[PDB]
């Protein structure tokens, strides 16, 4: 048995917070214990969460806040709840080590029920927390329900929400119920039913339709939304996952309640009561979404005034439509996901079927209420067409509405002709798998030939040394000279010459020898001493020396002389403070390698504001950058156009906007440098030469990997498709201006890993995402050798064995595929990547132990010849690195690179039986995962089903189940605890109050400066999206007169918002 | 230095021996039957030492041992089974002792003589077959008179 | 037979390993010349080495094992138990410094790692100056626990084997040790060399050379001669 009452929760992550890994495994335990969970997903303001909890009438709220600003956040929520009749709703929180003990006691004293620390998780266990959390919220909310309809009819939306909880639980008085239906009948409001197959897009299409209603009627309509999702009878509760897709329901005139079927039927047993309740609440329209219905299911029809059947082009044979009961009753049919293959033919089958069912032979098949929609697409003309149709039908059915402001267009089918990856190339990942496996098959065969060839000629020389000469052997040998390929033959031929190269003290110049205190010569690159030419060729093909195909041991011959791979992530407070931290890290280093971390506000493209939702997060967890002037200040004193200076900005959603700021900054620096070296402004021609030169030589990297946002980090603000569109615009801009030093995208999986994915999943997903971009650009008309060298990677290094060979595997898979499959050049076959030590592998308990783990992870990174390395501080679980903390992190790299003896060799991994076996295993495991994604429609197709997110969250749970368990030993956490129990007072990296006020004053000053050109520039930006030009090209001008928030919100009106994917 | 000189010489012999018999099998597969090769091969069977010959002979049997999930070896009248596999969170089988995948019997013998598996001469990779599981941290104590040092001994070792 | 002090005094890994094996073989010859049997005292012989940052330390243990096993078998004709050299490795104390004491846990980790990789029989870990506090000894004890229990590569018991670097280093260090044997032999054996103070002299020579390059800025020591504390 589950809880005593019908226990409901609202779960979400705090505002501008992408950390869902924590909250996701909580709503899973909640659901399994028998709770209905209305999951809102990541990035939710207080105003959002409270509104939801109030409309759903829940007993509890669970929020995860890892960005900081949690004190202000929860206080706001507690205040807002009490103010709007939700004092009895309990609030639970968690942020791991971010929420220090003092802040927990403060928040719990303020009103928060419980906030769970990592130490609480260890003591109570995963299920223990949720049990405690659920047992608290096990209360009957029907006592708060109104006894008369006076409140509800008046317009009280909170009373309505509570009346529904009474009606649903059947604790409403019979005389009240009949009185409700009596007024519901006289109410005469239209009830739109939206049903269809599972995952067809019912929720997404509903949200879009509501958006249409708002834009068309200037938000004058009062709409009630009743979404029903199927309930697992085993647990008792359900995962009501419809509200998470709704982005247009955030408005006082919109009300939404999530119902569980509670019958493992497609409608709640009290649905007619709930509908009637909304009708009596004087709503202009009631919309009802059902759960996944079968072919012969149509229970929504008798409860609504209009019914809409939603389907996808994938329905099998055309004869299947004769079995679908809903096609016989539906007033409107929407074929959503019209981007899928065979959408047009699907429409012609459905159209003809509806024509047959209505016996309208005297009508055209194209005139039937069958619409081809694409809800995923922003401002889809298809959806608008369906909307126009619904309006005409709702109008005749007594519903006053003003003459619309929307494009009253004609047609039944969407005209969205955009494609990221053509259906012809759908199985691209599978082909890549074949390519790699095919390469290895050749290595085996060519080795056997090279081996046999040597064995023969060896025996021939031994026979002649004894007397008996047999030319019969030579015939078989010469036979295998031709059997060997041209490339393979030259490999073995250059082998003795190759050995003589790496033998001496120099490489004709580069030194090969570093001598120890003992007087031992440590060769930078150690060559094998095989006699078998089979082993030589096998080695040369599978793992050649660093700087030779397939670049397994590194893409470069020898490691950089002065520029170490070190690149420390940094960001705190305003641009002024971070500019200090940059100078701290890069102090005493000729090569300035910066890595910038932005605050949660900037990461979501928002300007700093006074509201406690946002204000408390400004300057925390990263530098607050809102204007070009902030960006300039951030890198002041750093010559961005200097060859030995590279800047790595970690930004995803607003990445194009931030990149435009950086580019403008690098340009303006050289304009200032010229104005100083000449004492005059450069002419229009001089400036044009300077501006163009900057773009070509500017060295750095912008993350921007949107594919990983949907899957891992959740920093996607615009719609996925729009983000990918603009990301391409950036790469096109780079090509035109010959930006050959900047990396347009750091294809990452670190985030995917930190979410919980094991090294195999991380590596596979990341390479898959990378290959997706390749296919995307290839289908977009760019030469493979034009964008491939601009592709950067990012990985995580944890404690798992596979991490030791993660980099070398990624290099080989890339090199082989780029050569054989895509036929690209050498620069393209070379995969360069950044490795950051695993942050989740570090804990809040016994923080001194983390330096041990971060050392081991940093070691295998350097051993495997990484291109760039970040080291995590010991206080990783609690705060952004302190001045003392970042030095310990920076010392780990310095000690390994300078002091550590084995490190004096640049290929110590090579030869190792374990490394070579692990390399082969991990590689094949990755290839198999490629095939799993390929049979799900590619990366995009898998994302459509939430395959990656599902697999990540599953592995996250599996790990976490073991961490608390004890099966997976974690020193200082689940074993070898402290007899004292010390996790004292540690220094924390929060932002100064003055710094917050500074950013606000700087912003309003910047705004006042370009107040004239502001609206005009933003208008140009939206026209760039409408006319479908290059967005980034406009951003290069936009960031000069517009703030980060202004640009983001302008793009929202034309590029839409990200639809969360659970 | 004398030992290593032998490793070089015995490897060359083991290598040549394989190369000959390999060529002999390839000639017979084409039709030509030249036993002149076999004479040079059998000549190197004697050239190889007794110990070296047995090393290569036990190599395929050695591989089958470290291949499975367990290590069966019967001492006295009973037996002592030991696990070879530790599985990662990803589901990867990490073998306790990883054997080389050489085809050249020259490299096999060279490896077996210079660096045999842990628990085999010359014990380069360790004197024991597999590491002990589980505590081995000694309890050091020594201060003041014999009474104080004793108490600490008794206290730590409680 | 210990070599902890010999290295700690300043001797590089080659000198340490060579002198220690030489001392060990001296005991063997000493006991043999009392008319004793080799299989009676050889299994009782224990060894004790230092693991520093130098490259040679990565293969110090495996070299000692092979040199012992080969000589005990071929030269002295002893049994299997005698050919097996068991040793304790303690992380270098000299390699840890008073400046920036938090850095020492990094060095002690790396040294503990190659010890375990090379399949040592017993390992001591050094704490991060002051008295051996119960907190400081826990950080030292955690280094071993983390590597043995959490670290992934450690799940394999011969990760060194196969490595081109390891096998080349093993051969080099071995021969370097053998050459040092010959230097001691032409000085009258270990006892004869001690008579001239050869070992002491050579240890002292290397201790000075190290201490020189350290001050010279030539041998980088993080937190000591480079990347020094900007506050203290
Ligand atoms: C994984 C992780 C990420 C992943 C997130 C993946 C995902 N999809 O969630 C990635 C790599 C994407 C990431 C990114 C960022 N992160 Co981060 N991340 C972490 C990390 C390593 C662990 C957090 C985690 O998920 N832990 C797993 C959970 C399950 O365990 P736990 O935290 O110990 O929680 C326990 C209890 O507290 C309890 N509990 C916790 N929450 C809840 C909730 C409920 C309802 C209940 C009942 C219980 C409960 O359950 C657990 C039981 O053991 C932490 C550091 C750390 N190790 O603590 C940094 C950390 C949280 N991140 C940090 C930052 C700054 C960021 C970035 C903003 C960096 C940047 N500037 O770009 C980005 C962007 C985030 C975004 N997109 O908005 C900082 C926070 C600094 C601060 N707030 O002062 C941290 C502390 C790292 C650091 N030291 O700098 N992050
Ligand atoms: C919120 C959290 C979770 C995060 O997401 S934190 C994210 C942190 N991310 C990062 O720090 C990403 C960092 N990565 C990068 O900057 C890039 O991916 C990068 C490729 C590693 C950049 O490395 P760089 O030091 O700039 O080296 P490169 O760009 O390759 O070198 C420039 C040129 O120098 C030359 N070069 C560089 N290195 C060498 C070597 N070793 N040999 C020879 N020549 C060399 C060469 O000519 C290079 O250009 P090509 O002719 O095109 O080959
Ligand atoms: O005394 P310890 O050395 O601690 O061990 C007890 C015995 O186990 C043996 N031992 C200790 N560790 C191991 C491992 N890892 N494998 C096999 N045998 C071992 C050790 O040689 C002793 O045997 P004998 O000398 O033959 O009596
Ligand atoms: N390819 C494509 N995917 C869509 C479209 N509309 C919605 N989706 C996706 O389909 C998934 C499920 O959507 P959802 O609204 O929850 O469907 P529901 O469960 O039936 O209500 C999500 O990943 C949506 O992004 C579309 O027009 N095309
Ligand atoms: C998400 C991961 O990024 C790193 N990280 C996050 N924020 C910062 C910051 N301000 N400074 C340095 N590193 C940071 C940590 O290692 C964390 O685990
Ligand atoms: Mg839905
Ligand atoms: Mg639904």
From Swiss-Prot, chain A:
InterPro entries named in the record: Acid_CoA_mut_C (IPR006159), Cbl-dep_enz_cat (IPR016176), Cobalamin-bd (IPR006158), Cobalamin-bd_sf (IPR036724), GTPase/Isobutyryl-CoA_mutase (IPR052040), IcmF (IPR033669), IcmF/GTPase_domain (IPR053439), MeMalonylCoA_mutase_a/b_cat (IPR006099)
Activity regulation details: Is prone to inactivation during catalytic turnover due to the occasional loss of the 5'-deoxyadenosine moiety and formation of the inactive cob(II)alamin cofactor in its active site. The GTPase activity of IcmF powers the ejection of the inactive cofactor and requires the presence of an acceptor protein, adenosyltransferase (ATR), for receiving it. ATR, in turn, catalyzes an adenosylation reaction converting cob(II)alamin in the presence of ATP and a reductant to the active AdoCbl cofactor. The repaired cofactor is then reloaded onto IcmF in a GTPase-gated step, regenerating active enzyme.
Residues reported in the UniProt entry to bind GTP: 199-204, 245, 336-339, 944, 1061
Catalysed reactions listed for this entry: 2-methylpropanoyl-CoA = butanoyl-CoA; 3-methylbutanoyl-CoA = 2,2-dimethylpropanoyl-CoA; GTP + H2O = GDP + phosphate + H(+)
Positions of Mg(2+) 1 binding: 203, 242, 289
Binding site residues for Mg(2+) 2: 228-229, 242, 289-290
PROSITE patterns with a match to the protein in the record: B12_BINDING
Any one biological process term the GO annotation gives: acyl-CoA metabolic process
Gene Ontology molecular function, alphabetical: cobalamin binding; GTP binding; GTPase activity; isobutyryl-CoA mutase activity; magnesium ion binding; methylmalonyl-CoA mutase activity; pivalyl-CoA mutase activity
Binding site for substrate: 558, 593, 699, 743, 792, 827, 832
Sequence segments annotated as region (Linker): 397-550
Note: In many AdoCbl-dependent isomerases, e.g. methylmalonyl-CoA mutase (MCM), its G-protein chaperone is a separate protein.
Complexes and interactors: Homodimer.
Name of this protein: Fused isobutyryl-CoA mutase
Source organism per UniProt: Cupriavidus metallidurans (strain ATCC 43123 / DSM 2839 / NBRC 102507 / CH34)
GN (gene name): icmF
Curated annotation (Swiss-Prot), chain B:
Chain intervals for the UniProt region annotation (Linker): 1-122
Domain remark in the UniProt entry: Is composed of four functional domains: the N-terminal 5'-deoxyadenosylcobalamin binding region that is homologous to the small subunit of ICM (IcmB), a middle P-loop GTPase domain (MeaI) that acts as a chaperone for ICM, a structured linker region involved in dimer formation, and a C-terminal part that is homologous to the large substrate-binding subunit of ICM (IcmA).
Protein role: Catalyzes the reversible interconversion of isobutyryl-CoA and n-butyryl-CoA, and to a much lesser extent, of pivalyl-CoA and isovaleryl-CoA, using radical chemistry. Also exhibits GTPase activity, associated with its G-protein domain (MeaI) that functions as a chaperone that assists cofactor delivery and proper holo-enzyme assembly. The G-domain of IcmF also has a role in its cofactor repair. Does not display ATPase activity.
Family: Belongs to the IcmF family.
Complex and partners: Homodimer.
Remaining remarks: In many AdoCbl-dependent isomerases, e.g. methylmalonyl-CoA mutase (MCM), its G-protein chaperone is a separate protein.
Protein name: Fused isobutyryl-CoA mutase
Phylogenetic classification of the source organism: Bacteria, Pseudomonadati, Pseudomonadota, Betaproteobacteria, Burkholderiales
Gene that encodes the chain: icmF
Whole-protein residues included: 458 to 616 of 1093
Curated annotation (Swiss-Prot), chain C:
Binding site for GTP: 195
Binding site for substrate: 46, 81, 86
Subunit record text: Homodimer.
Annotated function: Catalyzes the reversible interconversion of isobutyryl-CoA and n-butyryl-CoA, and to a much lesser extent, of pivalyl-CoA and isovaleryl-CoA, using radical chemistry. Also exhibits GTPase activity, associated with its G-protein domain (MeaI) that functions as a chaperone that assists cofactor delivery and proper holo-enzyme assembly. The G-domain of IcmF also has a role in its cofactor repair. Does not display ATPase activity.
Additional remark text: In many AdoCbl-dependent isomerases, e.g. methylmalonyl-CoA mutase (MCM), its G-protein chaperone is a separate protein.
Domain-level remarks: Is composed of four functional domains: the N-terminal 5'-deoxyadenosylcobalamin binding region that is homologous to the small subunit of ICM (IcmB), a middle P-loop GTPase domain (MeaI) that acts as a chaperone for ICM, a structured linker region involved in dimer formation, and a C-terminal part that is homologous to the large substrate-binding subunit of ICM (IcmA).
Family: Belongs to the IcmF family.
Name recorded for this polypeptide: Fused isobutyryl-CoA mutase
Organism: Cupriavidus metallidurans (strain ATCC 43123 / DSM 2839 / NBRC 102507 / CH34)
Recorded name of the encoding gene: icmF
Residue span relative to the full protein: 776 to 1010 of 1093
């Amino acid at each position: 048995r589950g809880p005593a009452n019908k226990v409901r929760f609202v779960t979400a992550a705090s505002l501008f917070d992408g950390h869902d890994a924590s909250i996701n495994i909580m709503r899973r335990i909640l659901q399994s214990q028998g709770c209905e969970v209305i999951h809102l997903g990541h990035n939710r303001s207080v105003q959002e969460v409270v509104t939801a909890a109030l409309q759903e009438d829940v007993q509890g709220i669970a929020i995860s806040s890892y960005q900081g600003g949690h004190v202000e956040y929860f206080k706001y929520m507690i205040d807002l709840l009490r103010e709007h009749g939700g004092e009895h709703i309990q609030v639970f929180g968690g942020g791991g080590g971010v929420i220090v003990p003092d802040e927990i006691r403060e928040l719990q004293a303020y009103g928060v029920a419980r906030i769970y620390s990592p130490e609480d998780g260890q003591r109570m266990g995963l299920a223990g927390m949720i049990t405690d959390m659920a047992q608290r919220c096990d209360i009957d909310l029907t006592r708060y329900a109104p006894t008369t309809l006076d409140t509800v009819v008046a317009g009280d939306r909170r009373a309505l929400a509570q009346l529904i909880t009474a009606l649903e639980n059947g604790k409403a008085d019979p005389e009240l119920v009949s009185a409700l239906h009596a007024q519901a009948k006289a109410a005469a409001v239209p009830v739109l039913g939206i049903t269809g197959t599972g995952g067809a897009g019912k929720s997404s299409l509903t949200d879009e339709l509501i958006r249409r209603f708002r834009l068309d009627q200037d938000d004058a309509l009062s709409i009630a939304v009743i979404s029903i999702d199927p309930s697992r009878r085993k647990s008792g509760g359900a995962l009501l996952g419809d509200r998470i897709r709704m982005n247009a329901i955030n408005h006082p005139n919109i009300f939404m309640r999530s119902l569980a079927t509670r019958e493992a039927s497609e409608i709640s047993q009290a649905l007619p009561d709930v509908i009637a309740a909304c009708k009596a609440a004087r709503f202009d329209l009631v919309i009802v979404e059902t759960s996944g219905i079968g072919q012969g299911d149509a229970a929504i029809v008798p409860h609504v005034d209009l019914s809409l059947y939603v389907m996808t082009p994938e329905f099998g044979a055309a004869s299947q439509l004769e079995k679908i009961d809903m096609l016989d009753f539906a007033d409107f049919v929407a074929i959503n996901k019209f981007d899928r293959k065979g959408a047009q033919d699907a429409w012609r089958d459905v159209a003809k079927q509806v024509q047959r069912n209505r016996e309208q032979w005297h009508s055209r098949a194209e005139d039937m209420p069958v619409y081809g929609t694409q809800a995923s697409r922003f401002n889809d003309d298809g959806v608008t067409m369906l909307y126009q149709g619904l309006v005409g039908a709702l109008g005749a059915r007594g519903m006053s509405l003003k003459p619309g402001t929307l494009p009253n267009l004609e047609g039944r089918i969407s005209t969205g002709q955009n494609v990221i990856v053509p259906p012809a190339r759908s199985r691209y990942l599978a082909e890549l798998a074949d390519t790699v496996r095919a390469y290895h098959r050749r290595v085996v065969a060519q080795s056997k030939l090279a081996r046999e060839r040597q064995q023969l000629r060896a025996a021939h020389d031994m026979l002649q040394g004894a007397g008996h000469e047999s030319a019969a052997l030579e015939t078989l040998a010469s036979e295998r000279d031709v059997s060997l390929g041209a490339v393979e033959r030259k490999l073995l031929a250059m082998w003795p010459q190759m050995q003589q190269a790496y033998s001496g003290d120099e490489y004709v110049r580069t030194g090969l020898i570093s001598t120890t205190l003992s007087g031992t010569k440590i060769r930078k690159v150690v060559l094998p001493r095989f006699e078998d030419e089979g082993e030589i060729l096998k080695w040369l093909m599978r793992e050649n020396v660093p700087g030779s195909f397939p670049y397994t041991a590194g893409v470069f011959a020898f490691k950089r002389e002065g520029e170490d791979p070190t690149r420390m992530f940094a960001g705190e407070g305003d641009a002024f403070r971070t500019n200090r931290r940059f100078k701290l890290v890069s102090e005493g280093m000729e090569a300035k390698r910066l890595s910038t971390a932005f605050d949660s506000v900037t990461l979501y493209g928002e300007d700093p504001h006074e509201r406690p939702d946002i204000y408390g997060k400004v300057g925390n967890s990263g530098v607050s950058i809102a204007t070009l002037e902030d960006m300039k200040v951030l890198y002041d004193g750093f010559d961005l156009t200097n060859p030995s200076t590279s800047v790595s900005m970690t930004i995803n959603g607003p990445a194009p906007t931030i990149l435009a700021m950086f580019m403008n900054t690098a340009i303006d620096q050289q304009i200032d440098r010229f104005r100083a070296d000449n004492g005059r402004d450069p002419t229009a021609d001089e400036e044009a030469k300077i501006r163009a030169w900057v773009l070509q030589n500017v060295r750095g990297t912008v993350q921007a990997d949107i594919l990983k946002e949907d899957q891992g980090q959740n920093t996607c603000i615009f719609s996925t498709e729009f983000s990918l569109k603009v990301m391409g615009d950036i790469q096109e801009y780079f090509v035109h201006h010959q930006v050959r030093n900047f990396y347009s995208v750091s294809i990452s999986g670190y985030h995917i890993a930190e979410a919980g994915a094991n090294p195999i999943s991380q590596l596979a997903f990341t390479l898959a995402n990378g290959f997706t971009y390749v296919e995307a650009y290839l289908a977009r008309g760019m030469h493979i050798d034009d964008f491939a060298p601009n592709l950067s990677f990012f990985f995580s290094n944890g404690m798992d064995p596979e991490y030791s060979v993660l980099g070398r595997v990624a290099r080989r898979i890339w090199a082989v595929t780029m050569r054989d499959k895509y036929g690209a050049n050498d620069r393209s076959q070379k995969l360069k990547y950044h490795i950051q030590t695993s942050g989740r592998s570090l804990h809040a308990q016994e923080i001194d132990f983390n330096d041990i783990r971060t050392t081991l992870q940093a070691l295998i990174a350097i051993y495997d010849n990484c291109n760039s390395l970040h080291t995590n501080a010991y206080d990783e679980a609690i705060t952004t690195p302190t001045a003392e903390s970042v030095r310990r992190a920076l010392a780990i790299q310095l000690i390994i690179n300078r002091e550590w003896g084995v490190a004096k060799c640049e290929n110590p991994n090579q030869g190792s039986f374990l490394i070579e076996e692990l390399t082969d295993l991990v590689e094949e495991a990755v290839l198999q995962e490629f095939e799993r994604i390929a049979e799900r429609g590619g990366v995009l197709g898998a994302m459509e089903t939430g395959y990656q997110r599902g697999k990540i969250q599953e592995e996250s749970l599996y790990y976490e189940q073991l961490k608390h368990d004890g099966t997976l030993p974690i020193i200082g956490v689940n074993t070898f605890r402290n007899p004292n129990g010390d996790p004292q007072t540690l220094e924390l990296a929060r932002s100064s109050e003055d710094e917050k006020q500074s950013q606000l004053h700087r912003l309003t000053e910047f705004h006042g400066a370009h107040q004239a050109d502001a609206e005009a520039m933003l208008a140009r930006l939206r026209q760039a999206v409408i006319d479908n030009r290059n967005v980034f090209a406009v951003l290069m001008d936009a960031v000069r007169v517009c703030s980060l928030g202004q640009i983001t919100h302008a793009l929202f009106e034309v590029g839409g918002q990200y639809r969360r994917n659970m | 230095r004398a030992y290593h000189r032998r490793v070089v010489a015995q490897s060359k012999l083991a290598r040549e021996r394989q190369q000959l018999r390999a060529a002999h099998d390839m000639l017979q597969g084409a039709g030509h039957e030249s036993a002149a090769l076999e004479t040079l091969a059998s000549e190197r069977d004697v050239s190889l030492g007794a110990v070296e010959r047995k090393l290569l002979a036990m190599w395929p049997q050695m591989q089958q041992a470290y291949s499975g999930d367990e290590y069966v070896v019967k001492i006295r009248d009973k037996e002592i089974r030991t696990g070879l596999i530790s599985t990662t969170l990803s589901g990867t089988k990490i073998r306790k002792v990883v054997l080389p995948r050489f085809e050249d019997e020259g490299e096999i013998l060279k490896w077996l003589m210079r660096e045999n598996v842990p628990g085999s001469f010359p014990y380069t990779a360790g004197v024991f077959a597999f590491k002990r599981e589980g505590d081995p941290t000694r309890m050091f104590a020594g201060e003041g008179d014999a009474f104080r040092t004793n108490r600490r001994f008794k206290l730590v070792s409680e």
